[PDB]
Every structure is written in C-alpha cells, then in structure tokens.
Amino acid sequence: HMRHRTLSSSPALWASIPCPRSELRLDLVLASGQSFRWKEQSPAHWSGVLADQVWTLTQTEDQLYCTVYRGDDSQVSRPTLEELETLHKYFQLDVSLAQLYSHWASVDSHFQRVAQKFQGVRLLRQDPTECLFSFICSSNNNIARITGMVERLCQAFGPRLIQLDDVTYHGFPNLHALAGPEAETHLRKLGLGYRARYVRASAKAILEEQGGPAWLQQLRVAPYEEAHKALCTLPGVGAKVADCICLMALDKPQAVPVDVHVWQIAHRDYGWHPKTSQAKGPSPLANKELGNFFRNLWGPYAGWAQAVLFSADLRQ
Numbered sequence: 001h002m003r004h005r006t007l008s009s010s011p012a013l014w015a016s017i018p019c020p021r022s023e024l025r026l027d028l029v030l031a032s033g034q035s036f037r038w039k040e041q042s043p044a045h046w047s048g049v050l051a052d053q054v055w056t057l058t059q060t061e062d063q064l065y066c067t068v069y070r071g072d073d074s075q076v077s078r079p080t081l082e083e084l085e086t087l088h089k090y091f092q093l094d095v096s097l098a099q100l101y102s103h104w105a106s107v108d109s110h111f112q113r114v115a116q117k118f119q120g121v122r123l124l125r126q127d128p129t130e131c132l133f134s135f136i137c138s139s140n141n142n143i144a145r146i147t148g149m150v151e152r153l154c155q156a157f158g159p160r161l162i163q164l165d166d167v168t169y170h171g172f173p174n175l176h177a178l179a180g181p182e183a184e185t186h187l188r189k190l191g192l193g194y195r196a197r198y199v200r201a202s203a204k205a206i207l208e209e210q211g212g213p214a215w216l217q218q219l220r221v222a223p224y225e226e227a228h229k230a231l232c233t234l235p236g237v238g239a240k241v242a243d244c245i246c247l248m249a250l251d252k253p254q255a256v257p258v259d260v261h262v263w264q265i266a267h268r269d270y271g272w273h274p275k276t277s278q279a280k281g282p283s284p285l286a287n288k289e290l291g292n293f294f295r296n297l298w299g300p301y302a303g304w305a306q307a308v309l310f311s312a313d314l315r316q
C-alpha cells in the first residue's frame with residue numbers, strides 16, 4: 001500500500017541537512033561493508049532502518065535530503081529536529097573529512113591518488129548490538145550474502161516496523177531474542193551456517209557473562225585496547241571482527257581491521273612485509289604488526305583512512 005518515497009514524489013515530507021557531497025558520498029558508504037541495512041530501492045535513493053525507524057536518504061552536491069516513515073499508524077510528517085540530530089550523529093558529521101583526507105594525504109601519496117576518485121567515505125556510528133551480530137555474520141562471506149543473513153535474522157527475530165512496496169522492515173533484535181533455546185536452529189534454517197552458533201552463543205554470553213547491552217556501552221567509553229580484548233572473548237569474534245566493531249560502533253577511530261583486503265593492500269600498494277616477523281604470510285602477530293604500521297602512518301584516525309581504501313579496493 002505505502003510506497004518508498006522519492007524527492008520528486010513527496011517533497012513536502014523531506015527535510016535537508018547542509019552537507020557537501022565531498023564530506024559524504026551515500027553510494028560509497030551505505031553499502032560498502034559498514035552497515036548492511038541500506039538498499040538503493042530507487043536510483044540515488046537509499047532506504048534502511050535506523051533505530052527502530054525507517055529512512056530514505058538522497059543527496060545533491062551540497063545537500064543531504066532525508067525522510068522518515070514512523071509506521072505506527074502515525075500521521076506522516078517531515079523529520080523532526082531530534083531525528084535530524086540522530087542522523088547527523090549517525091554520519092558523525094561534526095568530523096571534517098576534508099581535513100582528515102589532507103592530513104592523511106600529507107604522509108601518503110598512494111592515499112592521495114586513490115582519494116581523488118573516492119571522496120566522502122566516512123564512518124557511520126552504529127549501534128553496538130547490530131554491528132556486533134552483523135560482523136559475526138561477516139566471516140568467510142561477501143557483502144551480498146551478509147546482507148541477506150542480517151535481513152532474514154531481523155525478519156525472524158526482530159519487531160516489524162513497516163512495509164514499503166514489497167519490502168518489510170524489521171528492527172534489530174534484542175539479545176534475549178537471539179539467545180533462546182531454538183535460536184541457533186532457526187538461524188541455520190535461515191542460511192547462517194556455522195555463524196548461527198556464534199550468534200546464539202554470543203547473545204547468551206553477553207547477557208549472562210557480561211550483564212546485557214550496558215556492557216557494550218561501557219566498551220564504548222573504555223580504551224580501544226580494553227574494548228578489543230573484551231570483544232575477543234566472544235564466540236566468533238576475533239581480531240578482525242573486534243576491530244570492525246571498535247571502529248564502527250565503539251568510537252575507536254584508530255581501530256584498523258586487518259582482513260585479506262588490507263593485508264593485500266599493504267603488500268601490493270605500500271610494499272609492506274612483516275618485518276620483525278620471520279613468517280612471511282598472515283598470522284595473528286603479523287596482523288597486529290600491520291595494524292600498528294597503519295596507526296603509525298596515519299595517526300589516531302587510521303581506521304577511517306583504512307575504510308577509504310577498503311571501499312576503493314571493492315570497486316575493481
């Protein structure tokens with residue numbers, strides 16, 4: 001019945017946030033391996049869920065245009081002030097990406113070349129739960145299959161928000177829902193394979209061993225290294241996944257996830273080899289060393305710089 005809006009359709013219901021294309025390219029951010037809940041349902045229009053509400057986002061060269069669907073038999077309105085701040089903070093727009101790109105460019109000619117083509121890659125500030133379980137699904141996987149798993153997981157376990165065209169949107173489930181006695185069985189039947197065990201076991205572990213979601217919020221204010229190490233006690237969470245969560249949801253901008261992509265980037269593009277290490281290929285020790293190399297080179301926002309290259313290594 002209700003349809004995904006476009007700017008043309010319902011301009012009475014869009015609000016705008018002053019935002020240069022150069023600070024944020026929706027198309028390079030929203031589906032390049034940070035969040036898995038956004039889809040271009042119609043051209044230049046991105047729809048997804050943000051905190052138990054649905055949004056559609058589109059942009060000009062200097063304007064970020066957005067609309068909200070409340071769902072709960074509400075009377076349609078433009079987004080409010082508080083909702084706009086929520087979106088502001090989700091894109092961490094207080095942070096200048098232009099100044100970061102210069103700062104990183106000043107020490108890295110390779111970064112300079114690549115960043116010509118790939119402007120407006122910034123980091124979303126995600127909900128810890130959602131980001132955690134999304135990244136547990138990320139092992140031995142690609143964006144598209146992850147996307148499918150997260151979507152089914154939310155339809156099967158999370159509350160219904162609204163339907164738009166033939167797309168039904170669910171909120172991310174709470175830990176208790178993912179932790180009950182049938183959850184692993186269900187999740188396998190939803191295609192998650194072995195990841196299903198890690199999801200259920202991690203939900204159960206945070207609840208019982210860590211005191212529920214308030215633990216993830218403490219990690220958000222704990223130092224990077226503490227957060228990292230604590231995340232790595234969870235089932236299915238290792239260094240890479242922990243780094244992603246650190247970077248993407250726990251306000252650790254120095255977190256540098258080292259996966260097959262950045263290991264390859266480092267060798268190919270920077271000529272880096274593990275130096276102290278005698279082993280030549282990947283290892284937990286060499287992966288940690290490579291993270292330190294990037295922090296050393298880029299500074300306390302290495303994780304954000306990493307994302308720019310990550311996003312570019314995906315596009316040929």
Ligand SMILES: CCCc1nc2[nH]c(N)nc(=S)c2[nH]1
Binds near residue numbers: 142259
């Ligand atoms: C396969 C998509 C999930 C994903 N894996 C990643 N690995 C690294 N190193 N960086 C980022 S930003 C990232 N995102």
Ligand code: NI
Binds near residue numbers: 267273
């Ligand atoms: Ni070599």
